[PDB]
């Protein structure tokens, strides 16, 4: 199930289970347009900034 949701504090959870990356569970910069590449690279864009 690849339906990933972003928590209020930026934790990536699938069905309430915190997703685990190469360094453990992922902490996303609170509020960000997450883009996942073809191999799993996560890019975060913060609102307002360029």
């Amino acid at each position: 199930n690849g339906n990933i949701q972003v928590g209020p504090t930026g934790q990536l959870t699938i069905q309430g289970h915190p997703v685990i990356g190469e360094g453990g569970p992922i902490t996303v910069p609170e509020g960000s347009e997450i883009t996942i590449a073809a191999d799993g690279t996560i890019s975060a864009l913060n609102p307002g900034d360029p």
């Binding site: 883009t35 590449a37 690279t41």
Partner: protein, 260 residues
């Protein structure tokens, strides 16, 4: 109800607005001191979807993602403040501006507007007023038994009385110039009111600082070029037809989606 239909609606609205601009320019061909308008359009929103520049494959970025855009919106209509052709009517009261100045007129409510139409009249009290009855500034007053009125190229006004071989100056007609002439708000009746985007009124007598020179017996005709208007008709019609074709295609797609 569907995105393509909203985009086509915006396109139809833009082309319609272009048609209103064309029709307004055409209706005022015979208007003295009229300036033709041109509308400017801009792109509407662009849905981000795939972000262009986001890193795919750790070391390769994604160029030019899905920037799905919405329709079009008109930015603003800008007047073309150019010198209209001068027409000779052989009248003592018609004044034409050849440069970049405006006449100042007082509305009876207290404020002042600015007009370029130079067809002036005299009220029952002898004041120089506009054809709509608005009293031009300054309140140049003309004597009762006037034989000839001479408005010079420097804006000076002289009246030739009987028994006096020397004309007597009865006023001084000034021109108002602005930093930005497109920012004046047109209120109709060939009148512009000053806005904050048009700076502040700069008084200057005709011939110095840039104010134009005043010609007597001439009127500044409208600068509307009509063949350009006809060519713009042809486009404003095809573009509207093509946008309606897009509406029809979206309608057919939705109809087949519904019928299944």
């Amino acid at each position: 109800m569907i995105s393509s239909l909203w985009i086509a609606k915006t396109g139809l609205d833009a082309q319609q607005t272009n048609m209103d601009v064309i029709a307004n320019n055409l209706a005022n061909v015979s208007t003295n001191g009229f300036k033709r308008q041109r509308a400017v359009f801009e792109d509407l929103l662009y849905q981000t979807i795939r972000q262009p520049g986001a890193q795919s494959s750790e070391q390769t970025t994604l160029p030019s993602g899905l920037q799905i855009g919405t329709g079009v919106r008109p930015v603003a209509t800008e007047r073309l403040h150019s010198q209209g052709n001068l027409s000779q009517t052989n009248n003592s009261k018609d004044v034409a501006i050849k440069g970049q100045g405006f006449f100042q007129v007082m509305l009876p409510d207290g404020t002042s507007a600015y007009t370029r139409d130079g067809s002036f009249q005299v009220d029952q009290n002898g004041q120089l007023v506009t054809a709509g009855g608005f009293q031009v500034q300054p309140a140049i007053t003309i004597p009762a038994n006037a034989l000839s009125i001479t408005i010079g190229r420097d804006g000076v006004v002289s009246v030739t009385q009987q028994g006096q071989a020397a004309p007597v100056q009865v006023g001084q007609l000034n021109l108002t110039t602005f930093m930005n002439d497109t920012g004046l708000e047109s209120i109709g009746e060939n009148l512009y009111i000053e806005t904050q985007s048009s700076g502040a009124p700069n008084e200057s007598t005709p011939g110095l600082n840039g104010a134009g020179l005043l010609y007597q017996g001439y009127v500044e005709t409208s600068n509307v070029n009509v063949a350009e208007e006809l060519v713009n008709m042809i486009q404003v019609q095809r573009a509207y037809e093509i946008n309606s074709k897009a509406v029809s295609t979206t309608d057919q797609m939705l109809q087949k989606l519904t019928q299944l």
